[PDB]
Design a protein around this ligand. Sequence first.
Ligand SMILES: *C[C@@](*)(O)[C@H](CCCNC(N)=[NH2+])NC(=O)[C@@H]1CCCN1C(=O)[C@H](N)Cc1ccccc1
Ligand SMILES: *[C@@H]1O[C@H](CO)[C@@H](O)[C@H](O)[C@H]1NC(C)=O
Ligand code: NA
Lengths: 29, 251
Amino acid sequence: EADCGLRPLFEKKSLEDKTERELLESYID
Amino acid sequence: IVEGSDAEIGMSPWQVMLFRKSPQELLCGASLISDRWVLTAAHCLLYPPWDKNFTENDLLVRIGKHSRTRYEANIEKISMLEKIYIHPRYNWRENLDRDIALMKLKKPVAFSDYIHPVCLPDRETAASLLQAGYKGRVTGWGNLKETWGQPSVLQVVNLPIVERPVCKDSTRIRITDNMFCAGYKPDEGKRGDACEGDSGGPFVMKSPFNNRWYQMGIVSWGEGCDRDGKYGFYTHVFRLKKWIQKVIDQF
Ligand SMILES: *C[C@@](*)(O)[C@H](CCCNC(N)=[NH2+])NC(=O)[C@@H]1CCCN1C(=O)[C@H](N)Cc1ccccc1
Ligand SMILES: *[C@@H]1O[C@H](CO)[C@@H](O)[C@H](O)[C@H]1NC(C)=O
Ligand code: NA
């Protein structure tokens, strides 16, 4: 998979974007 | 994108803009999957009912853009197309089944903080993430409302995948296994949808196991935009992975 799907300004910097938490929580609800 | 919001800068670095050269026109969205390959919807390139059939020289793609219009000098990159590959079984006649196409760039693009490829799903990803109720994310510079304005900045909206029987009963258009639908149901407290002009754009999901984003779908079609009881339809990327691999391995 190399480096695919890891954003330089977010994942690479251990920073979450403003709404990705909504996506992760949806795996529950 | 209807009822979404302005994207944060660099939030979707795989976002691509398909541009007509003459006249200048924003045609559709697309996504970066490697330094030389861009994925989009077939109907963005070929749609006879609308007298549409673009060839490589008619288009250009813009990568790394945030604003629609503003020239982001030396941040965005403009690439020419070496070749266009449309799925041989793309059904433009009836229901847009297999609405997918690949575009190979003449020269590899340099990745940057604003230009980076998305992952394509494999079996495990498709099995674990493409389930009703889970939310994905759609992005685009398409219409802000069902019409016939346009956004100044890339729009983003998170939407839940809908159960197949519900997708099927929400429309008289024949749906297939190569498509999935997403959107909120009436009265769920939230709305939102892709719309004309967003086609080719990615529906992505973040893996809870490795922190990576996978493009599960391609904005494909709908009826109106954001109507209660209607849902946006997307090309099922994993269902078509074998064809994608074949093209990239063969060219
Ligand atoms: C080409 C894309 O910009 C656009 C995306 C529409 C997404 N809409 C919603 N609500 N998420 N696709 C289209 O406009 C496609 C191209 C052919 C016509 N079309 C439609 O969506 C029609 N509105 C419905 C349709 C007609 C014929 C075959 C399939 C679907
Ligand atoms: C589009 O044009 C090309 C050449 O100009 C032709 O080969 C192709 O068949 C056309 N697409 C269709 C299916 O109408
Ligand atoms: Na709806």
